[PDB]
Design an enzyme around this catalytic site. Structure first.
Site, PDB file in Angstrom:
ATOM      1  N   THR A 176     -48.606  12.410  23.569  1.00 37.16           N
ATOM      2  CA  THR A 176     -49.829  12.255  22.727  1.00 37.16           C
ATOM      3  C   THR A 176     -49.816  13.282  21.605  1.00 37.16           C
ATOM      4  O   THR A 176     -49.745  14.482  21.856  1.00 37.16           O
ATOM      5  CB  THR A 176     -51.121  12.435  23.554  1.00 37.16           C
ATOM      6  OG1 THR A 176     -51.099  11.552  24.683  1.00 37.16           O
ATOM      7  CG2 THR A 176     -52.364  12.141  22.703  1.00 37.16           C
ATOM      8  N   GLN A 177     -49.889  12.794  20.370  1.00 39.26           N
ATOM      9  CA  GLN A 177     -49.857  13.642  19.186  1.00 39.26           C
ATOM     10  C   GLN A 177     -51.049  13.358  18.282  1.00 39.26           C
ATOM     11  O   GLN A 177     -51.721  12.332  18.409  1.00 39.26           O
ATOM     12  CB  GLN A 177     -48.581  13.378  18.384  1.00 39.26           C
ATOM     13  CG  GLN A 177     -47.316  14.013  18.934  1.00 39.26           C
ATOM     14  CD  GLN A 177     -46.198  14.076  17.899  1.00 39.26           C
ATOM     15  OE1 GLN A 177     -46.446  14.183  16.690  1.00 39.26           O
ATOM     16  NE2 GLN A 177     -44.957  14.025  18.371  1.00 39.26           N
TER      17      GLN A 177
END
Ligand SMILES: [Mg+2]
Lengths: 221, 231, 233, 240, 235, 250, 222, 244
Positions: free
Chosen positions: C1-2
């Protein structure tokens, strides 16, 4: 809506009686309100003496019951003897129990005959429940099937009357339950093994039953 | 003598005896021939049988649509190495959408065989391979030896009595190299080459094994009545 | 997750008769802040491919390093590294496409949209798109971000289908690209005036143009616009 | 982990470690199995060089694997405990998954498989043990008697013996046991078993152990006095 | 001592060659392939008369269309059979079809050389794998611990193998009927066996497309033994 | 690659001997003499500082080591083996005791942990035994003063007084004559110096002799004040000057 | 938060005849309200007379087709160049899909070809692997539009014989390749009119014993 | 590689014996003799210390007799270090059982598990076996007072009276002679000492060269007490039986 809709399938029943076991199922698969299929095989023919019914997740049931058939084949190769209904059902129930919480959706019934057990039905579902019993109805239209089945069930039914009651119970559910329908698949399990008793389209079967039986007076004739 | 117990040991003269003993297994193996022109590359293999009741051991293995090899020695080792090539050819196709170069195919085999000759416990591969292929730089023929040494050649042969076919190809070099756009004549030259390694036995319909790859020809293997043309 | 931090906007491109053109502005935005102005977002691989990247710049710089390393790796034990066995656009794209999809499958994506433009060894034009989801597609014109919404319509007026490619010259094609870059400067809030443009031709090869500017702009009509409705002064 | 291949082939095609494990079995106290018409009897020798023993607490030679199956052995005593433990676990595991107790053939096959695994696993030596596994399958009245050995081979026997001087007692059983007509009763079967041990043992005091297994989990071990009565009866008939 | 995966100066693996000697000590097993089916037969060889011969299981089913006979250290074959059965059923699960006899044999042979310093030593057992598929029809394979397998029209393994093989060389032809093949296995088994051949110390089996793999009863084999003796006396 | 020595290098011989332990004890025999004497109010441990070279600074090499504030150790045999044992002994006193009970282990239990480490080097794969014998002197509230010997086998014995190494046979005989149960600490130090002079050949002074005691608490050596219950370490290493003072009245 | 799935739109359609089978699919690729490509094929020849399409999230669709194509390749290597039957391919695909049961391929898969009797065969899959052979199947964005039309025209559902008082059903019969392509073309032109994610172009792959033929037709580009 | 230096500790001889186990027993036969005698109302454990030195601290020493729990003790014969490894394992195993079942571990179960550990070292792992033989003396409510012995082979057996270590042949003959079933603890104490006094390699048996322990029900009403004898208590019991 969010997330993919996967096929969810079928209303099934199977009851024990004087002349063996009746197994009846419908053929409808739905993805929400979309009718995906009306020609689904919800009965798996594991072997000449063993049947497995499918309800809930189509893929889950189809995949793991064909897998179950492979495990039953390996049993009779290793042990030189056909697997018991109890052992077959317990392989499946122990499998799904390992996946408990992961989100499998299965309502199955392992029906068959062996010498030591006689005619036997085992209910097996995805949250690990495993129950031996004489009568079971599983699926979205199970209650509708129960209503007709229970009110007409006796142990001393004939093979002809039992086959019809199973067929009629699915029809009842096919009619009322929106997520059930398509056609009825009948099976009769005896000491000699299972016998297929045909595919019965609800399109023709409903009117045939309505006219001959005089039932379904709620419907405009 | 005292220095052949395992592959991790050098002899006083600097030899690896286990690698040499693996090389010996190839000499016992049935003869196979490899040769190429500029348009096509051909493998010819004399298959061997246990007796008249048995089948003839398959010598040629396909690696990709454009590459494959023939074996001589331990067949299971050829299966391990050919499977590795199949994966490497396949990795090149899936990841880079690129047909694996025959030269890289050799480099990968060399390095795989090498690791087995420098570590305790393991053993060298007991098989020699002739890899043919057609890539972006035309036709190719490679010779693999389980010492790790891979060599690119116009033609060659490995196995028992391979020196006869290798001499013939050394004489015929100038002729067969220019057989361009003619598959059947290049095979004929390969069949005549392997014939120089025959003793008492001759090439029969279920004995001979031919394979070809080229410009507009995928790697295909010919056995049975399909090689009756070349006898 | 970015979440993407320093970002690059539209990359636009199209095919023409002998090759492909690709362009992208030189901005590294930090949210609304136009923080970095000397950012090159077109990265050539060899003399026959240009990779244009939008989205997260930290991930762009990682992809640069991968491509740089790919050229090195290809040269190893390869006598024909500058000839038959040189890196093709199709090879470079498929590699990136593999990586992008693998990373999205691990729920840790390279937060980018990528357009690989180039010319194959047989002269064929190559132009294909890939993004953080691993989604791939090809078209006579390709564009990312706002480019997809504003450039593609303009570029499709030149090359609407396959049959229009031979009929489109490099002069006509470059003119449309430069025009599209102007329109993006008018209308994209995270765009800059300065940009780079690259042409990969099958004959003349790779031409990389740096420090271009949007020009011939229409702003004069602004003086006549007063108020927001009724106001006359 | 210790990886050494201890069990390996020799030039003549023998696995000496497996064969040397058989020698350990040959050293062990004699054990005999005889199956009648409606029962199986497991006889076992106990060497009499050990006096001042406590027979209450000393590990018995015959071990219950389940309520319906028993296992006796010849060879290394310490090794036998490991096979018995595994067999007992597998017995309960079979009841848990198949909802039915093990057949004698299945339990034998499992134990034999364990013994075999130790003949081609790195870092381990073969079990210096041969077993006699006897009992009755669930809801079945046909007597079952199987033998296993270090190599891993197993087979069914009408009657069989293992251990020291087993070739003598096997010679006895081969002429005294009739296939067409096995021991019809429990007494006949126990007597033949005791007779066969009396060819080898020495004295019939606290040297012989007898365990009788009958259908439907009916297993019982005979006491000293009960066994001594068979010994007293056989010797009186012998003097003729 | 010395390494397990060591090569001899002649270029052979010591342990593989030594395992082949163990197989020569084993009981005889014979297989014959015909256009009407494949026949498998074995010598049981009971070590003592008290041993119940029917418990000697040297012929084994892998799937409905594939059978197997063994010779040598027969305990080693259990894990090989287990693998073969899993491979056969697993392929049916993945591909909704019967698995090719050759592919099954190859899968078994992949275990063979997975030994060293994986298991500690090679298998000390040879297998005759017989079966049928739609593509290549009736087949007979000989799977060794070397990892090698040959297809055979007919094949004998075990102690009387070289004597039996020479006999199979003369007797085999391409037009053999199933009945002729059954008698031929019995004939050759009786020739190489130490003790006199009967229904208790020898076993027959076959695989046909129609009825699949079947181990013959002692009653059925006994009649074929009686039919065999009469035909030899008839000329 | 990887450690393929997963098997024991110490095994029983037909005679029942564990060769490597015997050979380790032989290495200890070659080692320099060290000794320990237990008094009523203290314990003394001592050894010769065999210098490898006169250019070497023998102060940097410490044969007598502090394990805990109330426990000390000296050895005979292989110095490097001893050094790493002291490191492990110190760490195990914390990990397996002080970090659990909030106090230092009693002498017997620390000795037990050291013995365990030395036993494992006798049985574990791919290792040889430690080539040292330790003498561990120490004090704890409930056992009082105590002195232990630890051998390469992992075996340990409590001693009133003992010696190990080169001239241990003669030194033990000397201690039997002089030792009594009424010995004060100063008397035990005196006897230790007399016993050690017999085994030492060259120079005999505070610079060639290493000697430490387990005696009264030392508040001055604690490093801080303010906690009445913390009264300081009972282990004290005698200085070069302190030894020479006792050598005059010898 | 990062969302690993996307919707690339489009729609696919499989019909089976007596000695043939067609697998059609539009060539439009989209995200949200934007067109990515007007010609991006998503119906693929996979070898062994098997055509395949995995419509929905294109990244997953491509990955699946890529893996199946690779499965066909290794089937040849491991089983002596044996032809992979359509029924065997279907079962293999089930295991591919179910393999990611807990992180699914967001696609509706359809394969087409000939069965082992030489008769036309179409198989359809849900995202997690449940599959079924049918004469007829539409999949994707406009499946809901096309499918009921196919029930009516291919399987003659709700059609009775004129004058028989709704007692005798219209008899089932196989359609000619000509008649099937007519239905495909009309199905897609209709779907293009009423579904925004469908248009640009139509690519049909026909499968007979002779091989795999292709036909392309223009669709409305709005 | 390393194959060259491997002793192969877990293999059979041609005769079917375990080399290392046999040699470990040969080691144990030189260890100080330990005797266990089981009476009707208790158990005696007697053991001879290995050639004592006069400067050995005797009162605060433990070489032969170890406590496993409140109801079970062991006499050691062999390598002390090896025994302590096994003792700490046995102590832990007893506590695991108590934690699991809230009941003190039955003697045999503890003995079996300790013996199973020894067995493992003879079948796998390539390590040398533990050069130790135990005499287990303990009590539980199932079998009452029990004596067992285990050796490096991992084989254990139960006894009424038993000796391990040195001169067991001579010791076992003397025990077999004078032992009888209706024996008391006080009589068994005397037998244990008399047996050691005759089988000892020393000139005379003294208090300082012995370790002694009893397990009686001599506590107040239906409970077991473990008495590890003090030096002075051994001195007194030695005079009381007329050995010194
Ligand atoms: Mg539209």
């Amino acid at each position: 809506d969010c997330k993919i809709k996967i096929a969810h399938g079928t209303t099934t029943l199977a009851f024990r009686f004087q002349g063996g076991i009746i197994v009846a199922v419908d053929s409808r698969a739905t993805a929400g309100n979309w009718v995906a299929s009306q020609t689904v095989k919800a009965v798996i023919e594991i072997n000449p003496f063993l049947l497995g019914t499918m309800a809930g997740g189509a893929a889950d049931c189809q995949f793991w019951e064909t897998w179950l058939g492979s495990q039953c084949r390996l049993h009779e190769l290793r042990e030189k003897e056909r697997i018991s209904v109890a052992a077959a059902s317990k392989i499946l129930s122990n499998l799904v129990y390992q996946y408990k919480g992961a989100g499998l959706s299965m309502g199955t019934m392992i029906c068959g005959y062996t010498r030591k057990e006689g005619p036997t039905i085992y209910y097996v579902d995805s949250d690990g429940t495993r129950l031996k019993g004489d009568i079971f109805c599983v699926g979205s239209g199970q209650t509708f099937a129960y209503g007709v089945l229970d009110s007409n069930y006796k142990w001393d039914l004939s093979v002809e009357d039992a086959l019809y009651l199973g067929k009629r119970s699915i029809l009842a559910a096919a009619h009322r339950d929106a997520y059930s329908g398509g056609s009825v698949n009948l099976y009769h399990v005896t000491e000699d093994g299972w016998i297929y008793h045909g595919n019965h389209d609800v399109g023709e079967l409903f009117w045939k039953v309505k006219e001959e039986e005089g039932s379904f007076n709620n419907v405009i004739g | 003598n005292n220095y052949d117990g395992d592959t991790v040991t050098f002899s006083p003269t600097g030899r690896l005896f286990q690698v040499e003993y693996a090389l010996e297994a190839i000499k016992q193996g049935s003869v196979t021939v490899g040769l190429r022109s500029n348009t096509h590359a051909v493998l010819v293999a004399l298959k061997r049988n246990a007796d008249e009741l048995s089948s003839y051991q398959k010598k040629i293995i396909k690696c990709d649509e454009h590459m494959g090899l023939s074996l001589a020695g331990l067949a299971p080792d050829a299966r391990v190495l050919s499977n590795y090539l199949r994966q490497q050819c396949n990795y090149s196709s899936l990841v880079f959408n690129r047909k694996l170069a025959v030269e890289r195919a050799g480099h990968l085999l060399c390095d795989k065989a090498q690791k087995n000759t420098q570590s305790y416990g393991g053993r060298p591969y007991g098989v020699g391979l002739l890899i043919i292929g057609y890539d972006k730089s035309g036709a190719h023929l490679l010779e693999f030896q389980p010492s790790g040494n891979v060599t690119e050649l116009y033609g060659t042969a490995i196995g028992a009595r391979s020196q006869g076919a290798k001499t013939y190809l050394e004489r015929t070099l100038d002729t067969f190299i220019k057989i361009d756009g003619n598959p059947d004549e290049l095979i004929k030259a390969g069949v005549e080459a392997i014939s120089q390694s025959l003793r008492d036995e001759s090439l029969t319909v279920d004995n001979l094994s031919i394979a070809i790859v080229g410009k507009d020809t995928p790697f295909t293997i010919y056995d049975g009545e399909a090689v009756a043309k070349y006898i | 997750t970015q979440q993407p931090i320093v970002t690059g906007t539209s990359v636009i491109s199209m095919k023409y008769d002998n090759g492909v053109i690709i362009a992208a502005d030189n901005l590294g935005s930090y949210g609304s802040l136009l923080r970095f102005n000397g950012v090159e977002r077109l990265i050539p691989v060899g003399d026959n491919t240009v990779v244009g990247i939008s989205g997260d710049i930290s991930d762009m710089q990682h992809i640069e390093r991968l491509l740089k390393d790919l050229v090195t790796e290809n040269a190893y034990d390869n006598p024909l590294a500058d000839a038959e066995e040189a890196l093709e656009p199709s090879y470079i794209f498929e590699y990136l496409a593999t990586v992008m999809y693998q990373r999205r499958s691990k729920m840790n994506p390279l937060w980018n949209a990528i357009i690989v433009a180039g010319v194959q060894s047989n002269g064929d034009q190559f132009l294909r798109y890939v993004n953080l989801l691993g989604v791939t597609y090809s078209s006579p014109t390709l564009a990312t971000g706002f480019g997809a919404h504003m450039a593609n319509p303009l570029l499709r007026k030149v090359v609407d289908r396959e049959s229009d490619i031979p009929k489109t010259t490099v002069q006509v094609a470059e003119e449309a690209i430069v025009n599209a870059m102007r329109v993006l400067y008018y209308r994209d809030a995270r765009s800059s005036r300065n940009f780079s443009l690259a042409i990969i031709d099958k004959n003349t090869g790779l031409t990389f143009k740096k420090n271009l500017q949007v020009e011939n702009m229409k702003w004069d009509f602004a003086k006549d616009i007063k108020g927001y409705g009724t106001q006359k002064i | 982990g210790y990886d050494r291949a201890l069990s390996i082939f020799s030039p003549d095609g023998h696995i000496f470690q497996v064969e040397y494990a058989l020698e350990a079995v040959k050293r062990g106290t004699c054990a005999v199995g005889v199956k009648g018409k409606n029962c199986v009897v497991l006889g076992c020798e106990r060497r009499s060089t050990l006096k001042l023993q406590d027979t209450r607490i000393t590990p018995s030679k015959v071990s219950k694997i389940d309520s319906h199956v028993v296992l006796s052995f010849s060879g290394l005593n310490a090794d036998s405990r490991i096979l018995i433990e595994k067999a007992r676990v597998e017995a309960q595991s079979h009841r848990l998954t198949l909802e039915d107790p093990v057949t004698v053939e299945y339990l034998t096959r499992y134990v034999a498989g364990v013994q075999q695994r130790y003949t081609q696993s790195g870092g381990v030596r073969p079990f210096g043990v041969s077993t006699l596994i006897a009992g009755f399958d669930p809801r079945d009245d046909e007597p079952k008697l199987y033998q296993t050995e270090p190599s891993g081979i197993y087979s069914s026997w009408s009657a069989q013996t293992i251990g020291r001087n087993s070739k003598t007692v096997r010679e006895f059983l081969e002429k005294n046991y009739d296939r067409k007509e096995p021991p019809a009763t429990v007494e006949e079967c126990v007597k033949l078993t005791v007779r066969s041990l009396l060819e080898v043992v020495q004295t019939g005091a606290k040297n012989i152990e007898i365990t009788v297994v009958k259908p439907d989990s009916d297993i019982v071990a005979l006491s000293s006095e009960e066994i001594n009565q068979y010994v007293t009866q056989i010797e009186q008939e012998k003097q003729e | 001592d010395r390494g397990v995966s060591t090569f001899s100066p002649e270029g052979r693996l010591f342990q593989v060659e030594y395992s082949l000697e163990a197989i020569k000590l084993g009981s005889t097993a014979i297989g014959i392939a015909t256009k009407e089916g494949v026949v498998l037969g074995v010598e049981k060889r009971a070590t003592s008369p008290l041993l119940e011969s029917d418990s000697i299981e040297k012929i084994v089913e892998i799937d409905r269309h594939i059978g197997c006979a063994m010779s040598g250290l027969t305990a080693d074959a259990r894990s090989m059979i287990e693998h073969a059965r899993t491979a056969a059923v697993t392929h049916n699960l993945y591909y909704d079809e019967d698995i090719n006899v050759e592919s099954l044999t190859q899968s078994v042979c992949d275990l063979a050389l997975r030994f060293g310093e994986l298991m500690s030593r090679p298998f000390g057992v040879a297998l005759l794998i017989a079966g049928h598929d739609a593509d290549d029809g009736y087949q007979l394979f000989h799977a060794e611990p070397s990892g090698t397998f040959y297809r055979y029209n007919a094949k004998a393994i075990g102690s009387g193998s070289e004597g039996a093989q020479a006999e199979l060389l003369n007797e085999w032809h391409s037009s053999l009927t199933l009945k002729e093949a059954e008698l031929l296995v019995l004939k050759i088994l009786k020739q190489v066996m130490e003790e006199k051949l009967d229904e208790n110390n020898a076993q027959l089996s076959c695989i046909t497309k129609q009825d699949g793999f079947k181990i013959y009863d002692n009653e059925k084999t006994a009649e074929l033994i009686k039919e065999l003796k009469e035909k030899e006396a008839a000329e | 690659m990887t450690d393929r020595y997963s098997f024991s290098l110490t095994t029983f011989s037909p005679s029942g001997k564990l060769g490597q332990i015997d050979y380790a004890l032989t290495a200890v025999k070659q080692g320099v003499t060290s000794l320990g004497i237990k008094a009523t109010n203290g314990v003394v441990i001592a050894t010769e500082k065999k210098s490898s070279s006169p250019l070497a600074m023998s102060e940097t090499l410490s044969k007598v080591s502090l394990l805990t504030p109330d426990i000390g150790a000296v050895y005979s045999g292989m110095g490097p083996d001893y050094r790493v044992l002291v490191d492990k002994s110190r760490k195990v006193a914390h990990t397996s005791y002080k970090r659990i009970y909030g106090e230092y282990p009693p002498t017997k239990l620390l000795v037990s942990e050291v013995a365990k480490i030395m036993q494992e080097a006798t049985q574990s794969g791919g290792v040889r035994p430690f080539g040292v014998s330790l003498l561990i002197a120490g004090h704890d509230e409930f056992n009082g003063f105590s002195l232990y010997q630890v051998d390469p086998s992992g075996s340990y014995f409590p001693w009133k007084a003992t010696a190990i190494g080169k001239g241990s046979v003669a030194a033990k005989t000397f201690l039997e004559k002089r030792w009594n149960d009424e010995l004060e600490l100063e008397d035990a130090i005196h006897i230790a110096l007399l016993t050690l002079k017999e085994s030492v050949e060259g120079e005999f002074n505070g610079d060639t002799i290493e000697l430490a005691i387990i005696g009264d608490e030392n508040p001055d050596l604690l490093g801080y004040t303010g906690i009445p219950t913390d009264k300081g370490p009972r282990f004290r290493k005698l200085t070069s000057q302190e030894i020479n003072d006792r050598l005059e009245a010898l | 938060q990062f969302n690993p799935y996307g919707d690339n739109g489009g729609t696919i359609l499989g019909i089976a005849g007596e000695d043939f089978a067609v697998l059609a699919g539009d060539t439009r690729n989209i995200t949200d309200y934007s067109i990515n490509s007007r010609y991006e094929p998503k119906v693929f020849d996979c070898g062994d007379n098997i055509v395949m399409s995995a419509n929905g999230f294109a990244a997953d669709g491509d990955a699946l087709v890529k893996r199946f194509k690779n499965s066909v390749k290794w089937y040849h290597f491991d089983h002596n160049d044996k032809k992979l039957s359509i029924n065997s391919a279907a079962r293999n695909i089930q295991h591919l899909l179910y393999g990611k049961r807990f992180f699914p391929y967001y696609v509706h898969t359809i394969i087409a070809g000939l069965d082992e009797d030489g008769k036309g065969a179409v198989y359809s899959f849900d995202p997690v692997g449940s599959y079924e052979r049918e004469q007829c199947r539409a999949g994707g964005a406009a499946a809901s539009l096309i499918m009921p039309f196919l029930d009516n025209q291919v399987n003659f559902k709700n059609q009775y014989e004129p004058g028989t008082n709704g007692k005798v059903k219209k008899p089932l019969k196989y359609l000619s390749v000509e008649e099937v392509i007519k239905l495909v073309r009309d199905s897609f032109t209709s779907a293009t009119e009423r579904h925004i994610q469908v248009g640009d172009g139509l690519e049909i792959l026909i499968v007979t014993k002779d091989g795999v033929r292709k036909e392309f037709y223009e669709l409305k580009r709005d | 590689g390393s194959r060259r230096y491997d002793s192969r500790t877990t293999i059979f001889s041609p005769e079917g014996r375990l080399y290392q186990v046999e040699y470990a027993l040969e080691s144990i036969s030189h260890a100080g003799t330990a005797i266990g005698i089981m009476a009707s109302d208790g158990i005696v454990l007697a053991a001879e210390r290995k050639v004592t030195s006069t400067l050995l601290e005797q009162d605060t020493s433990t070489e032969k007799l170890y406590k496993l729990n409140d109801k079970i003790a062991v006499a050691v014969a062999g390598l002390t270090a090896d025994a302590e490894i096994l003792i700490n394992t046995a102590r832990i195993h007893a506590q695991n059982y108590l934690k699991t079942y809230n009941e003190d571990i039955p003697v045999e179960i503890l003995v079996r598990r300790l013996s199973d550990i020894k067995q493992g070292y003879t079948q796998h792992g390539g390590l040398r076996p533990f050069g130790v033989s135990f005499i287990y003396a303990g009590y539980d409510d199932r079998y009452g007072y029990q004596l067992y012995t285990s050796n490096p082979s991992g084989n254990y057996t139960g006894w009424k009276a038993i000796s391990v270590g040195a001169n067991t042949s001579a010791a076992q003959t003397l025990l077999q002679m004078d032992y009888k079933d209706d024996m008391k603890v006080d009589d068994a104490i005397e037998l244990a000492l008399k047996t050691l006094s005759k089988t000892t390699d020393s000139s005379a048996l003294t208090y300082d060269r012995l370790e002694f322990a009893t397990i009686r029900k001599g506590a107040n009403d239906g409970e077991v007490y473990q008495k590890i004898f003090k030096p002075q208590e051994i001195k007194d019991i030695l005079v009381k039986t007329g050995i010194t």
